[PDB]
Amino acid sequence: QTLLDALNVRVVGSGERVLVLAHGFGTDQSAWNRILPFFLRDYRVVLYDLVCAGSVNPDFFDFRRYTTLDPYVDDLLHILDALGIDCCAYVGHSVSAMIGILASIRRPELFSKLILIGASPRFLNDEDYHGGFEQGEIEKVFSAMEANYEAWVNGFAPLAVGADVPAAVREFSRTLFNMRPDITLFVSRTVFNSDMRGVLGLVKVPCHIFQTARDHSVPASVATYLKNHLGGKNTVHWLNIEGHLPHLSAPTLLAQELRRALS
Incomplete structure (x- = not known):
């Protein structure tokens, strides 16, 4: 009820x-x-x-x-539950990919399919797993964020969008500026220090792992890790898109692959 209002829930479409x-x-x-x-x-x-x-x-x-x-x-x-949905397809970008994995483990009949975009179960490297980041690198992100939020956004937004799409950079920057830096940091700590690797095999629904070329936050090999460790039938879709935000930077190609995956 006020939950639906609080999170600006919106339902559109004729299907x-x-x-x-x-x-x-x-x-x-x-x-x-x-x-x-x-x-x-x-x-x-x-x-x-x-x-x-x-x-x-x-x-x-x-x-x-x-x-x-x-x-x-x-x-x-x-x-x-409040919308009365007991069966759906789910598309999650970034942290929402991991949220969908967890929701599917709690509710195994709820999702006919998970489509994961720019997903990683773990960002930090160790001697048998490459996540893309050392603890030192991540500490420099956190300190930069806190030292000068605007300067951090300005340098981060272009790396994230990745492809030369300045209007997408501006759009991603504005949604980053709308967030209170406080919350941005705390959430970044939550995300960087999560480790979903141990639960991937508990997922039983089919997962489509959408992975771009040159994702600053997700090495190629992490998409293969997901494919190999997620418990159901998995398919990696190697997007002919550069960057972490393909729904912003190449929406036509993304819509096309999504359509195929949902088919």
Whole structure:
């Protein structure tokens, strides 16, 4: 009820099959705007904002509660329960990929399919796993963020978008500026220090792992790790797209692959 209001839940489209579009770190549901028109005819599309989105009243970000991904999972399932959805396809970018994995383990019949975009179960490297980041690198991100948020956004947004699409950089920057730096840091700590590797095999639904070329936050080999460790039938879709935010930077190609995956 006020949960649906709090997270700006929005349902659009003329179809009966339910498609949930779940945004990732640094954006809000508007990240789906250039993809959305392709799905209005065949689906009932559910969109919402994570509690950390800059579009959500930060009064709702309870730092005592949102200490791991589990309470994000709680929010997602309560939205779906409150809308009366017991079967859907789910698209999750970034952290929302991991949220969907967790939700699927809690509710194995709820999702016919997970489509994961720019997903990683773990960013930090160790002697048998390459995540893409050393602890030192990550500490420099956190300190930069806290020392000068605007300078951090300005240098981070272009690396994330990756491809030379300045208008996407501006769009990603604005959703990063709408977030309170406070929350951005705390959520970045939650995400960087998560480790989903041990639970991947508990997923039984088919997963489509959408992986771009040159994703600053997800090495190629992490998409193969997901393919190899997720418990169900997995397919990696190697996007002919550079960067971490293909729904912003190449929405036509992304919509096309999504359509195929959902088929």
